[PDB]
């Protein structure tokens, strides 16, 4: 296909390895590039942890209001929001918003702890039918992105199907799904990634991720006007441990996808 040829050309120009999955909810058609290869998720995994806590809140109806203590020992490498509340508390809702909209790593670790460890996040993926996702570590070591290492990876196809189920499907209850959508639409870290390759008119909710080996990721739900929504996953990683991030590759992949509508 023409889109597959342009994505291959983009990958060749970039020097790395690119993975893309698009789901068009209009006809349930899919476009895949390296769709079944594993990529390190980095912070895109935060969506699964937040969704797992939302699922718990279907039965524990005030869970999201539960205060959680932030102590100095809890702070890791990147904690833009949690730092503002050290020696105080944040609710699970506030921690979920911080993990999703600012990529706060302390917030992610608190969500992992609430779920009983990485195995609790992976279990939620299995419960909604994702047999590919695996979360093995906490922050910040889940971002090592070592070539060939299966820890903390998924495939573009699997993450696109899961993100569709969580945001447009019924894997979560109605209030929970609406909350997740609201959080994703309010992300602050995504301006230079998928969003930058799409019409300024389209509404996007996304979660970025970055890590070692120049790993640069973004997963998005896209609402074009007068048209069914799309789900787009773009993963990118590079051969040198110290490579720079390449958000422009993700923007270019989105632009190529959008050309073909």
Numbering used by the authors: 27 to 57, 59 to 238, 240 to 289
Question: What text does the study give?
Answer:
Serial crystallography at conventional synchrotron light sources (SSX) offers the possibility to routinely collect data at room temperature using micrometre-sized crystals of biological macromolecules. We show here the versatility of this setup and methodology by performing structural studies at room temperature (RT) of three additional enzyme systems of biological relevance: (i) Klebsiella pneumoniae CTX-M-14 β-lactamase, a β-lactamase relevant to multi-antibiotic resistance mechanisms; (ii) Nectria haematococca xylanase GH11, a highly active xylanase suitable for industrial applications; and (iii) Aspergillus flavus urate oxidase (UOX) in the presence of the long-lived intermediate-like 5-per­oxy-9-methyl-isourate (5PMUA).
